[PDB]
Short mmCIF file of C-alpha atoms in Angstrom, two decimals:
data_model
loop_
_atom_site.label_atom_id
_atom_site.label_comp_id
_atom_site.label_asym_id
_atom_site.label_seq_id
_atom_site.Cartn_x
_atom_site.Cartn_y
_atom_site.Cartn_z
CA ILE A 1285 180.21 137.88 134.75
CA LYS A 1286 179.28 133.95 134.65
CA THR A 1287 179.64 132.10 131.48
CA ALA A 1288 177.37 128.98 131.49
CA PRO A 1289 176.59 126.17 129.21
CA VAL A 1290 173.44 126.64 127.36
CA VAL A 1291 171.57 124.74 124.68
CA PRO A 1292 172.71 125.79 121.35
CA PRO A 1293 169.77 127.57 119.21
CA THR A 1294 169.63 125.32 116.53
CA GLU A 1295 168.78 122.28 118.52
CA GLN A 1296 165.41 123.05 120.31
CA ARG A 1297 162.67 124.23 118.72
CA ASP A 1298 159.69 126.50 120.27
CA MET A 1299 156.21 124.61 119.64
CA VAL A 1300 153.22 126.32 120.43
CA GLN A 1301 150.69 124.15 122.36
CA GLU A 1302 146.85 125.27 122.94
CA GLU A 1303 145.51 123.67 126.22
CA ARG A 1304 141.43 123.38 126.09
CA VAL A 1305 139.66 121.98 129.12
CA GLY A 1306 136.72 120.82 126.76
CA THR A 1307 135.45 120.38 123.50
CA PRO A 1308 132.94 123.06 122.69
CA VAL A 1309 129.30 122.16 121.60
CA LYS A 1310 127.97 122.36 118.30
CA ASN A 1311 126.35 125.73 118.69
CA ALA A 1312 128.84 127.32 120.62
CA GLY A 1313 127.94 130.81 119.77
CA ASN A 1314 124.21 130.24 120.56
CA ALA A 1315 123.00 130.98 123.79
CA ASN A 1316 119.53 129.40 122.88
CA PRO A 1317 119.59 126.64 120.22
CA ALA A 1318 116.58 125.56 121.23
CA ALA A 1319 114.49 128.82 119.96
CA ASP A 1320 114.61 127.28 116.60
CA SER A 1321 112.13 124.26 117.73
CA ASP A 1322 110.36 126.34 120.64
CA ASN A 1323 109.32 128.92 117.57
CA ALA A 1324 108.52 126.29 115.00
CA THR A 1325 104.89 126.88 115.44
CA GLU A 1326 103.92 125.55 111.79
CA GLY A 1327 105.87 122.34 112.13
CA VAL A 1328 109.00 120.80 111.06
CA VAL A 1329 108.86 117.92 108.20
CA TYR B 85 115.78 108.48 89.77
CA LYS B 86 115.28 110.36 86.99
CA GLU B 87 112.45 112.60 85.46
CA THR B 88 111.02 111.14 82.34
CA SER B 89 107.75 112.16 82.16
CA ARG B 90 105.60 109.16 83.21
CA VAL B 91 103.01 108.34 80.64
CA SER B 92 99.11 107.57 81.51
CA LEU B 93 97.19 106.21 78.90
CA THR B 94 95.28 109.57 76.98
CA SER B 95 91.81 107.78 75.91
CA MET B 96 89.73 104.96 77.07
CA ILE B 97 89.72 103.25 73.90
CA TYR B 98 86.00 102.19 73.24
CA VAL B 99 84.98 99.05 71.14
CA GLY B 100 81.79 98.20 69.61
CA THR B 101 80.53 99.39 66.06
CA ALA B 102 77.04 100.36 67.23
CA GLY B 103 75.77 102.14 70.27
CA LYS B 104 76.85 104.56 72.84
CA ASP B 105 79.51 104.66 75.53
CA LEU B 106 78.70 104.41 79.12
CA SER B 107 80.74 107.49 80.35
CA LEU B 108 79.55 109.69 82.66
CA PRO B 109 77.11 112.57 81.84
CA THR B 110 79.33 115.46 81.10
CA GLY B 111 78.20 117.61 83.73
CA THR B 112 78.63 115.07 86.49
CA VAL B 113 82.17 114.82 87.71
CA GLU B 114 81.99 118.83 87.17
CA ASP B 115 79.26 119.02 89.74
CA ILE B 116 81.28 116.79 91.96
CA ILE B 117 84.43 119.09 91.78
CA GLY B 118 82.13 121.99 92.78
CA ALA B 119 81.05 120.45 96.05
CA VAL B 120 84.16 119.78 97.09
CA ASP B 121 85.26 123.15 96.53
CA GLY B 122 82.64 124.24 98.80
CA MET B 123 84.34 122.76 101.61
CA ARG B 124 87.39 124.56 101.03
CA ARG B 125 89.40 121.88 103.09
CA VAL B 126 92.27 121.63 100.26
CA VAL B 127 95.33 121.19 101.74
CA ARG B 128 98.73 123.19 100.43
CA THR B 129 100.83 123.03 103.23
CA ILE B 130 102.92 120.26 105.45
CA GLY B 131 104.12 121.96 108.19
CA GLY B 132 104.78 125.24 106.51
CA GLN B 133 106.61 122.84 103.54
CA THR B 134 104.41 123.24 100.57
#
């Protein structure tokens, strides 16, 4: 048995951190966001 | 902006107590519209948008 001094549970707080490597684009779920333009065969106002 | 029924004048008020006016013959602009209708160029859409 080894009794060791630890940090009291009430003087620390677990905080969830979300780590990201880059900011997702506007049309993140779209494989081809350029197909709204390539399929505008009548024009756009 | 507000939609408040922009007003145009309802009639060309003619003055003169004697004579006839100089308005076009009643079948003159009707024959012009019919000729323009034959060309069938009436534009209705601007890039799909009406």
